[PDB]
Design a protein around this ligand. Structure first.
Ligand SMILES: Cc1cc2ncn([C@H]3O[C@H](COP(=O)(O)O)[C@@H](O)[C@H]3O)c2cc1C
Ligand SMILES: Cc1cc2ncn([C@H]3O[C@H](COP(=O)(O)O)[C@@H](O)[C@H]3O)c2cc1C
Ligand SMILES: O=C(O)c1cccnc1
Ligand SMILES: O=C(O)c1cccnc1
Lengths: 346, 346
């Protein structure tokens, strides 16, 4: 793990310079394609991409797990929905499934801690049947967090070996916006009231309790904001840790990762805290409708491309942004050149 | 034309209610897919779509034309670039071409007034070789505007007959951000300084002249803000009128139209002024980096989905948003149902 972290490659400035020069000579006024241009250059700098903005196979990894904090009345959906939805993932009827098929990406459902019997078709990496209730103690042990980070990391890079060049991250876990809000509060220094949202339609009257739960979690655990692994283990969850692991793994592999929504922002904060070298590999997707979204993004210094008022999770926003990434590649490789048209601009 | 305007269909509230009900029962917390849900319902209400969110063939119509106002020093690119780029459109090397191919849409290049010899492969609907310099008079006659609106309108609907269900609108015309800014100022009541941008990299020092040009255009022509056709003819251009015609034509055909950037906003304002019934058929794409973008969008009451800092035009932003439209359809038709999973949420 320390090894893994040590081995994350820095971006290729040379490839990026070459990329920038090419883009400037394309059939358009310079810089006119805006973020589509900056995205291509960012991609060019990723060592796993071979010096150019390229997209091979795509995969969305969905990390599923239950949380003990559910018992605190912070979620309106029955606990079983995690298990139910996880099986549905295997049938291609879910939101991420539909959107992924649309983008030509494959969905990988991973069980990191669902509180139910094992589901056939789902990759088994279960840590335990649900994590501990953060309100009264820690979600898990440090050891547990570390081992899962490692395991997911390797799984992520192994995919690279099979042609995957673009990843998307997602989750499934009733009550997960609670630990997400806690982490956000911790890493960001924001008060719980400011980053606690409605999650999956929590009634406005139940909010206050959710806020109390977050503060309690923090107070009791005393997580260290300067230690990403400490925070994850204490007030995180298996699903959030898994998402963080995807991030570490893509980075180590020198490949890009598309974030999703609020839960993913949580995970991204942790990843970046753990290894700043991870940052350059991250790509925002959409601007989640969760209250704490603005604050989290500001701390990541990220401006998402899509404003869809989305708040489903599952990696649905990540799937939706995949075509944008492919567009930046299409622009780069298939547009003609000014010179070839004898076009001269000041 | 009055006929045409009269015959624009109102949206199907019945189909929309049915759509809403279906969406609510899908495998997710209600309303969780945000704008993706509102988009599907909007589509369902369009009579040309047959009571459901559907996407058949896609086409982007690019309206090309030169402007006399170029002579005022409001554009840094040589005049010939319009003609040059228009031919390139026929070779598939341009920005819209690349992005359209990416989205599986076909590009239709239409010459509505390029100041050069006719270009083989380009649809000929040329009004004149460039429009009049708005700084000293009108761009064209009312008759001319009306005839072009009509002609483009019919062409647009005819495509519908050939399987096209989704349109995108675009343009090509050096100096076109000038008449665009003028129209915006007129329809919106904003001062020229507030809506005049850098267009295709106009140097910050040249701005002031561009602003003076806009005011002069307005002062001299005295366009009537309550008469969209009056405004277009006076301080518009053949390209902008053509874009407006696409809009009128899709609406008459009861089909959706994706806007592009700043130039398209101009055209949309005019279209809506001319026929409010057009509004429900319009779909924003991206948030153009042109200064006057915020003001124009506010007047259309539109919030774009994409924030890419784009400012190329050609209908490139429209092509980029096509997959989003297709996603809303995919969601609608392929997601599973809560009921089928025995999932019950309050
Ligand atoms: C049917 C259904 C499908 C979902 N897919 C993702 N979520 C989302 O809702 C949960 C977070 O919200 P909270 O913290 O309020 O539980 C996670 O499962 C998240 O993925 C879903 C939720 C439901 C009910
Ligand atoms: C090579 C080239 C390709 C383009 N494609 C679109 N535009 C854009 O630039 C023009 C508007 O900017 P202004 O008002 O400053 O001229 C239009 O042609 C618009 O389509 C282009 C401009 C250039 C130079
Ligand atoms: O932003 C998300 O991904 C999200 C928000 C609320 C509930 N589930 C997921
Ligand atoms: O927003 C646009 O479409 C645009 C902006 C500047 C120049 N050309 C096009």
């Amino acid at each position: 793990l320390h090894a893994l972290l040590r081995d994350i490659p820095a971006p290729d400035a040379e490839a990026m310079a070459r990329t920038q020069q090419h883009i400037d000579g394309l059939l358009k006024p310079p810089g006119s394609l805006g973020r589509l241009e900056t995205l291509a250059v960012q991609l060019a700098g990723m060592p796993g991409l071979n010096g150019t903005p390229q997209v091979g196979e795509k995969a969305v990894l969905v990390m599923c797990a239950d949380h003990g904090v559910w018992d605190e009345g912070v979620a309106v959906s029955p606990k079983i929905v995690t298990a139910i939805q996880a099986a549905n993932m295997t049938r291609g009827t879910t939101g991420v499934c539909v959107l992924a098929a649309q983008a030509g990406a494959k969905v990988h459902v991973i069980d990191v801690g669902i509180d139910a019997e094992p589901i056939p078709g789902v990759v088994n990496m279960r840590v335990a049947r649900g994590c501990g209730n953060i309100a009264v103690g820690p979600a898990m042990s440090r050891l547990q967090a570390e081992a899962l980070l490692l395991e997911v990391s390797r799984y992520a890079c192994d995919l690279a070996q099979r042609g995957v060049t673009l990843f998307g991250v997602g989750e499934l876990g009733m009550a997960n916006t609670t630990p997400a809000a806690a982490m956000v509060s911790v890493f960001t220094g924001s008060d719980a009231k400011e980053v606690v949202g409605i999650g999956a339609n929590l009634p406005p009257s139940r909010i206050d309790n959710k806020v109390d739960v977050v503060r309690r979690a923090i107070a009791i655990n005393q997580p260290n904001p300067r230690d990403g692994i400490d925070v994850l283990s204490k007030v995180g969850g298996f699903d959030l840790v898994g998402m963080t692991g995807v991030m570490l793994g893509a980075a180590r592999c020198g490949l890009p990762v598309l974030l999703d929504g609020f839960l993913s922002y949580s995970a991204a904060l942790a990843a970046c805290q753990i290894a700043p070298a991870v940052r350059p590999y991250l790509i925002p997707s959409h601007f989640s409708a969760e209250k704490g979204a603005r604050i989290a993004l500001a701390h990541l210094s990220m401006e998402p491309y899509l404003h869809m008022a989305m708040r489903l999770g599952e990696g649905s926003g990540a799937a939706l942004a995949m075509p944008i990434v492919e567009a930046a590649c299409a622009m780069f490789h298939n547009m003609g050149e000014l010179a070839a048209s004898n076009i001269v601009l000041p």
